[PDB]
UniProtKB/Swiss-Prot annotation, chain B:
Function: Component of the ribosome, a large ribonucleoprotein complex responsible for the synthesis of proteins in the cell. The small ribosomal subunit (SSU) binds messenger RNAs (mRNAs) and translates the encoded message by selecting cognate aminoacyl-transfer RNA (tRNA) molecules. The large subunit (LSU) contains the ribosomal catalytic site termed the peptidyl transferase center (PTC), which catalyzes the formation of peptide bonds, thereby polymerizing the amino acids delivered by tRNAs into a polypeptide chain.
GO annotation, cellular component aspect: ribonucleoprotein complex; ribosome
GO terms for biological process, alphabetical: translation
Name of this chain's protein: Large ribosomal subunit protein uL5
Family the entry assigns: Belongs to the universal ribosomal protein uL5 family.
Quaternary state and interactors: Component of a hexameric 5S RNP precursor complex, composed of 5S RNA, RRS1, RPF2, RPL5, RPL11 and SYO1; this complex acts as a precursor for ribosome assembly.
Transport is among the record's keywords: no
Keywords: Ribonucleoprotein, Ribosomal protein
Any matching Pfam family: Ribosomal_L5
InterPro entries noted in UniProt: Ribosomal_uL5 (IPR002132), Ribosomal_uL5_C (IPR031309), Ribosomal_uL5_CS (IPR020929), Ribosomal_uL5_dom_sf (IPR022803), Ribosomal_uL5_N (IPR031310)
UniProtKB/Swiss-Prot annotation, chain C:
Protein name (record): Ribosome biogenesis regulatory protein homolog
Signal peptide: none
Positions of disulphide bridges: none
Pfam families noted in UniProt: RRS1
Subunit structure: Component of a hexameric 5S RNP precursor complex, composed of 5S RNA, RRS1, RPF2, RPL5, RPL11 and SYO1; this complex acts as a precursor for ribosome assembly.
Source organism per UniProt: Chaetomium thermophilum (strain DSM 1495 / CBS 144.50 / IMI 039719)
InterPro entries, alphabetized: Ribosom_reg
Region entry Disordered, spans: 72-93
Localization in the cell: Nucleus
Curated annotation (Swiss-Prot), chain D:
Function recorded in the entry: Component of the ribosome, a large ribonucleoprotein complex responsible for the synthesis of proteins in the cell. The small ribosomal subunit (SSU) binds messenger RNAs (mRNAs) and translates the encoded message by selecting cognate aminoacyl-transfer RNA (tRNA) molecules. The large subunit (LSU) contains the ribosomal catalytic site termed the peptidyl transferase center (PTC), which catalyzes the formation of peptide bonds, thereby polymerizing the amino acids delivered by tRNAs into a polypeptide chain.
InterPro entries cross-referenced by the UniProt entry: Rbsml_uL18_euk, Ribosomal_uL18_C_euk
Protein name: Large ribosomal subunit protein uL18
Subunit and partners: Component of a hexameric 5S RNP precursor complex, composed of 5S RNA, RRS1, RPF2, RPL5, RPL11 and SYO1; this complex acts as a precursor for ribosome assembly.
GO terms for MF: 5S rRNA binding; structural constituent of ribosome
Record keywords, A-Z: Cytoplasm, Ribonucleoprotein, Ribosomal protein
PANTHER family hit by this protein: LARGE RIBOSOMAL SUBUNIT PROTEIN UL18, RIBOSOMAL PROTEIN L5-RELATED
Example GO biological process: ribosomal large subunit assembly
Taxonomic source organism: Chaetomium thermophilum (strain DSM 1495 / CBS 144.50 / IMI 039719) (Thermochaetoides thermophila)
Pfam families to which the protein is assigned, alphabetical: Ribosomal_L18_c, Ribosomal_L5e
Family note: Belongs to the universal ribosomal protein uL18 family.
Localization of this protein: Cytoplasm
Domain of life: Eukaryota
Swiss-Prot record, chain E:
Start-end of each WD repeat: 14-54, 57-96, 100-129
Name the record gives this protein: Ribosome assembly protein 4
The organism's place on the tree of life at top rank: Eukaryota
Role noted for this protein: Involved in ribosome biogenesis. Required for processing and efficient intra-nuclear transport of pre-60S ribosomal subunits. Interacts with the AAA-ATPase Midasin, which is essential for the ATP-dependent dissociation of a group of nonribosomal factors from the pre-60S particle.
Compartment(s) of residence: Nucleus, Nucleolus
Subunit structure: Associates with the pre-60S ribosomal particle. Interacts (via WD repeats) with uL18. Interacts (via UBL domain) with MDN1 (via VWFA/MIDAS domain). Interacts (via WD repeats) with NSA2.
Coiled-coil segments on the chain, per record: none
Family listed: Belongs to the NLE1/RSA4 family.
Taxon lineage: Eukaryota, Fungi, Dikarya, Ascomycota, Pezizomycotina
Taxonomic source organism: Chaetomium thermophilum (strain DSM 1495 / CBS 144.50 / IMI 039719) (Thermochaetoides thermophila)
Length: 65, 169, 188, 286, 129, 266
RNA sequence: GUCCUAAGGGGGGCUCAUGGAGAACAGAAAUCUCCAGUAGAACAAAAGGGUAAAAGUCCCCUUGAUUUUGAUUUUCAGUGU
RNA sequence: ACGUACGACCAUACCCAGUGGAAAGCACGGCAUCCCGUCCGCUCUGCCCUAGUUAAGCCACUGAGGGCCCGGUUAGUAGUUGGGUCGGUGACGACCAGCGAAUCCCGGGUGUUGUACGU
């Protein structure tokens, strides 16, 4: 995880970095091997949390592509 | 040098104008009757300035016109001067060599009367050019037509008399 | 032919401006013949161009890119006058002074966005501007009006322009404050 | 009142001479030659494409302070050396002329003792760079299917790096944003002209003879155009500087000087002008 | 000396499925052969960036294209257990398809030109069987 | 500023930390000789991209009143000016004017020698491309005066004229033209302006052998009247601003080769 | 009191105010045609030289209403991603 | 020398009219299947270079009326700064210098030029 971009409930929750459902986070996509049109290596992208980490013990996210 | 084939007078275009002055169903009828007369869609003209006396407003469609080129222009001008009985005035011809007239009833041309569209009159204007008119119209190297190549009032009157067998009074 | 020249005083260089300075005197011949005069001047020019080319090709790093073979130049060192004065901080306005005294922090760029979520319609809408929420109801087909405000309303005016009236009043107050701040800054 | 008076004539400011002649768009020229994304002080080349009634003119041009310079020039009437004798202004001839100019540029540069500072400062990890030029279409309209882009396509195929997109080539579809390379190949090898030949041969034989009267006279069928243009491309890539002699009268430069000065009307001298003025004064007195 | 390629020459469409094999002609770079998952092979004129021929007849993905060492034949092996030989100057299939494999034919290899005997060429096909 | 275009113009004319390349305005007086006009044409040809040109006659004597010059600098955003004049006392004069904050910073007069002047068209060589910067060579002992004089002022003014656009990189193919200004200390010394094109030859070593060929123009000047800057305005003009990309050095704080901020303890 | 897929940006095409000669109603003033028209129109500013295949005017595309990153500049930070 | 294409100075090149143009090139031109665009294949775009024609464009020469551009003259003169240097109470006059006009008048002119390919 690189950063927490937007918690949908509160900017205070975004500032505290709370990982809940629907949260937009920044992730390191170096392992995915994404190359841009100019040949640069895209190593940071946005994902959305699709689960409840407080209930599951794990953070599940889907890349916003 | 006047016997050169490139100086031959011919019709450049024929413009048919209906200045209704009021927007709406009347203007649509004028556009429709222009459409059957020409065979192509007409152009709506908007008023430049507003005049309270004429009851017009700026940027309001008040007139309609069609530009026709080729032998279609020749046959429409033949129809118009058939209505005018091949008789024109010296008052009509311009100093630049163009001419024109106006009719009051479009039924006299040969269009069957339809009471849905009504009765309209029209202004016919014919422009006359010699070959070589591309010089002042093309995008690249646009220039001015020379003085000897320009068409005079006497030349276009003589052309009309010789071609339509008409009379100018 | 040699590619190095020897002179009593060495050249100085400013490779940012591609400038070569020769402090050695130009011993111009004291004759009137143009061919030998320009020959001497061309010899001086050739010497300067030679040392400049040598300096550029030896003491600048070279990169071969798809654009070509580029020399990386140092920033210019020759002291030259500016055309305009160095930018300075603006005079502090009344709001800026008040916020500095009261510890009022600037709003974040996410906080000051022109976007909000309308719950009742369930859509995203703008707070101001074209179709903004500050003009809510001006195109609403049905508006209930209170009888007291309708009676106190002047003749000819409608309820559909009240929000535009309020917006115009607020804009006029804001522009009056802006003009006062501009006049005070101009006096300063 | 007279609008063209002395005050109007004194206050009038003329445009540029080539703007009055209607040959140069200086607004586009300024951005073509005096604008650069990078400031590496490098020379810039443009491929100037111009069209006449009977010829195509392609040039490789740099801009200097006292006038432009031509690096190489190719003309569509030089295709007669490579076998193209008809349709010297069609899209395929535009393609072949652009290809010929590209091959001539590469042959002149040797990309097919004085030396350059690039060779002086070349490093170990350095590769050969392509020749680069920007297209100059002049006052022509840049629509889909124009022959300026055929010239550009031929030059890019010949080996000049010209920045371009593919949305103005014949066969491009704007609704799908996809180029039909079948239609592109048809236009490159002149299949549109050939298809017009069979269309006229089936519909209007008199129009077919009137438009293609040279084609039947030279006995060039519609089905041979693709082979003819392919063989022309191969000959262009083989020998870019093949000499072509025209059927025009041939004299030396001094003989042409004499022939033109034979028909030049000399300007009258001051003595002759004063004599004519005195004769006019005498005629006015009489 | 071979200089490094640095820019796109031509992007040529025409295949409806991903391209699974590509190979230049041994004569020159003007002719290129590709085989794809749309059950077809294609020849490309790389000078003008244009298609030349479309070889059709396989019913599986063309897993391999291979030019003959002299350049007079193009052999294509496909997922339909078949190998076909085509004439690259006309785009026509030479005789019938080669049958006998039980599963997908994955690779092809021509006999070297100096080893050809009995007035014929020899082709080796490796399959999943 | 209502329109975004006028807003862009005001933002372009606004003072900046990194200044724009300077613009030169070429203009002439009520009377001006043909040789002076040819010299102005040659200088404008050398500086086409960052110049603007007037074409009327201006009733301006710059060393008496320069309010009109300040107004022209204000209107055209031109910080350098070349002013042409002719006279009985001064037959061919080029007045170089340098501005600061739309006010006259300093001025210098050049008297052109008419008999030795040669234009660019009189040399049948390949010319400089439009927009390409030439390199500069200043030769002689007149430019090393310990006190600021007319020759140091002329050196600074010609450097500012032939700067072009600054750049951190340059292609090796952009080193083909050189402008040489020669002047010696001493009856009046002659400041000679020449332009040459540069050819390179093999010499058997790594460095090439440079040979020159004259490009034009050929100018000979005598330095005339001089208006020096006010010391306070000169100090404000010679102040140097620092870009945000120039890090202020902090004690015991550094950047490593990976970009980490590193502190040092002792 | 009304109206607007907002302004802006890019690209392309065109030339304006006016005058003369002409065209049923149409007559100083409606619309259309030609010729002449250095801008005398429009848009900005307050030129003592703004803009004419445009900076004017109509089409096409975007309209996403204030992007991301920064060890760098300035200020701030008891909520220092 | 002439023509064409890109140009450089941007009226000595502009506004109006007449006369002529070998060669080739430009140009007017012919036709609307395909590419493309219009109310109108007028413009733009595609195809033909065959046929007609120098009528216009273009070029050269000439002609008026304006305009424009050089050089001299005005003239080192008006005017403006300096008690500068001499008087004048001072103002101001002359003298000494420094900067420095324009009108009028006279004479000349109505385009030079680079690259490339051709005649």
């Amino acid at each position: 995880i690189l950063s927490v971009k937007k918690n949908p409930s509160n900017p205070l929750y975004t500032q505290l970095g709370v990982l809940t459902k629907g949260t937009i986070i920044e992730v390191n996509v170096s392992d995915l091997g994404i190359v841009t049109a100019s040949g640069k290596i895209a190593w940071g992208r946005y994902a959305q949390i699709t689960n409840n980490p407080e209930n599951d013990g794990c953070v599940n996210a889907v890349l916003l592509v | 040098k006047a016997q050169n084939p490139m100086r031959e007078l011919r019709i450049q275009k024929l413009v048919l104008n209906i200045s209704v002055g009021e927007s709406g169903d009347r203007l649509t009828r004028a556009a429709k009757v222009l459409e059957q007369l020409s065979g192509q869609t007409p152009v709506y003209s908007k008023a430049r300035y507003t005049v309270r006396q004429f009851g017009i407003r700026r940027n309001e469609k008040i007139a309609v016109h069609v530009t026709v080129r080729g032998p279609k222009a020749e046959e429409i001008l033949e129809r118009g001067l058939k209505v005018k009985e091949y008789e024109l005035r010296r008052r009509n011809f311009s100093e630049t060599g163009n001419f024109g007239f106006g009719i009051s009833e479009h039924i006299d041309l040969g269009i069957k009367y339809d009471p849905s569209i009504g009765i309209y009159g029209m202004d016919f204007y014919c422009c006359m050019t010699r070959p070589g008119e591309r010089v002042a119209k093309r995008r690249r190297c646009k220039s001015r037509i020379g003085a000897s190549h320009r068409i005079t009032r006497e030349e276009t009157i003589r052309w009309f008399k010789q071609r339509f067998d008409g009379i100018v009074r | 032919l040699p590619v190095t020249v020897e002179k009593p005083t060495p050249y100085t260089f400013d490779l940012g401006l591609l400038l070569a300075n020769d402090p050695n005197p130009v011993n111009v011949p004291k004759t009137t013949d143009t061919q030998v005069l320009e020959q001497h001047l061309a010899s001086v020019a050739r010497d300067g161009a030679q040392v400049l080319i040598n300096q550029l090709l030896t003491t600048t790093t070279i990169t071969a890119t798809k654009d070509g073979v580029l020399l990386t130049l140092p920033p210019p060192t020759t002291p030259l006058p500016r055309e305009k004065p160095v930018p300075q901080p603006k005079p502090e306005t009344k709001w800026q002074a008040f916020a500095r005294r009261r510890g009022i922090k600037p709003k974040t760029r996410e906080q000051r966005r022109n976007l909000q979520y309308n719950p009742t319609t369930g859509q995203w809408e703008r707070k101001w501007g074209y179709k903004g929420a500050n003009k809510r109801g001006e195109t609403d087909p049905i508006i209930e009006v209170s009888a007291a405000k309708e009676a106190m309303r002047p003749e000819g005016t409608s309820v559909r322009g009240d929000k535009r009236r309020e917006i115009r009043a607020r804009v006029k107050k804001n522009q009056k404050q802006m003009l006062r701040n501009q006049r005070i800054a101009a006096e300063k | 009142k007279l609008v063209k008076n002395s005050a109007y004539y004194s206050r009038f400011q003329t445009k540029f001479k080539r703007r009055r002649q209607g040959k140069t768009d200086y607004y586009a020229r300024k951005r073509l030659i005096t604008q650069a994304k990078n400031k590496y002080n490098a020379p810039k080349y443009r491929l100037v494409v111009r069209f006449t009634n009977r010829d195509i003119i392609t040039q490789m041009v740099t801009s200097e302070i006292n006038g432009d310079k031509i690096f190489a020039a190719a003309y569509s009437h030089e295709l007669r050396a490579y076998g193209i004798n008809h349709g010297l202004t069609n899209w395929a001839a535009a393609y072949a002329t652009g290809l010929l100019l590209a091959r001539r540029v590469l042959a002149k540069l040797g990309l097919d003792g004085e030396y350059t500072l690039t060779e002086a400062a070349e490093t170990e990890d350095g590769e050969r760079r392509p020749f680069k030029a920007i297209l100059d279409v002049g006052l022509a309209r840049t629509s889909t299917g124009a022959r300026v882009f055929g010239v550009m396509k031929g030059a890019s195929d010949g080996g000049i790096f010209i920045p371009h997109s593919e949305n103005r080539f014949p066969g491009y579809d704007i609704e799908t944003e996809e180029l039909d390379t079948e239609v592109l190949k048809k236009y490159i090898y002149g299949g549109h002209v050939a298809e017009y030949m069979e269309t006229l041969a089936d519909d209007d034989e008199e129009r077919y003879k009137s438009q293609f009267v040279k084609y039947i006279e030279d006995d060039v069928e519609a089905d041979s155009l693709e082979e003819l243009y392919a063989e022309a491309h191969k000959q262009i890539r083989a020998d870019p500087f093949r000499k072509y002699v025209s059927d025009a009268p041939k004299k030396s430069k001094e003989e042409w000087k004499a022939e033109s000065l034979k028909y030049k009307k000399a300007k009258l001298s001051r003595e002759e002008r004063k004599a004519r003025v005195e004769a006019k004064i005498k005629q006015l007195l009489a | 000396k071979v200089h490094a390629v640095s820019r796109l020459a031509h992007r040529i469409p025409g295949h409806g499925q991903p391209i699974l094999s590509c190979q230049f002609s041994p004569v020159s770079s003007s002719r290129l052969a590709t085989g794809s998952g749309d059950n077809t092979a294609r020849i490309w004129d790389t000078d003008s960036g244009t298609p030349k021929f479309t070889l059709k007849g396989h019913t599986g993905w063309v897993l391999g294209v291979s030019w003959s060492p002299d350049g007079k034949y193009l052999a294509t092996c496909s997922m339909d257990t078949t190998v076909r030989v085509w004439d690259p100057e006309s785009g026509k299939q030479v005789n019938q398809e080669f049958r006998g494999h039980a599963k997908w034919v994955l690779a092809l290899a021509w006999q070297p030109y100096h080893l050809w005997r009995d007035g014929t060429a020899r082709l080796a096909s490796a399959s999943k069987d | 500023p209502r329109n975004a275009r006028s807003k862009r113009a005001l933002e372009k004319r606004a003072p900046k930390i990194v200044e724009n390349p300077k613009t030169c305005l070429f203009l002439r007086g009520t009377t001006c000789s043909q040789i002076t006009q040819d010299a102005m044409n040659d200088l404008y040809a050398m500086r086409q991209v960052h110049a603007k040109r007037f074409h009327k006659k201006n009733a301006i004597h710059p060393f008496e009143d320069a309010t009109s010059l300040c107004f022209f600098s204000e209107k055209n955003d031109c910080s350098l000016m070349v002013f042409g004049s002719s006279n009985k006392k001064r037959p061919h004069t080029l007045t170089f004017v340098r501005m600061f904050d739309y006010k006259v910073l300093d001025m210098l007069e050049f008297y052109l020698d008419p008999d030795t002047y040669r234009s660019i068209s009189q040399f049948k060589t390949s010319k400089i491309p439009i927009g390409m910067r030439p390199m500069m060579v200043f030769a002689g002992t007149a430019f090393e005066s310990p006190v600021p004089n007319a020759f140091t002022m002329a050196k600074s003014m010609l450097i500012d004229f032939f700067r072009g656009e600054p750049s951190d990189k340059i292609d090796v193919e952009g080193l083909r033209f050189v402008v040489v200004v020669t002047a010696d200390e001493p009856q009046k010394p002659i400041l000679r302006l020449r332009v040459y094109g540069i050819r390179t030859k093999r010499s058997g070593t790594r460095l090439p052998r440079v040979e020159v060929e004259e490009h034009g123009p050929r100018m000979d000047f005598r330095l005339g009247r001089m208006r020096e800057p006010d010391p306070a305005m000169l100090k404000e003009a010679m102040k140097k601003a620092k870009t945000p990309q120039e890090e202020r050095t902090k004690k015991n704080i550094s950047m490593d080769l990976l970009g980490d901020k590193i502190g040092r303890i002792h």
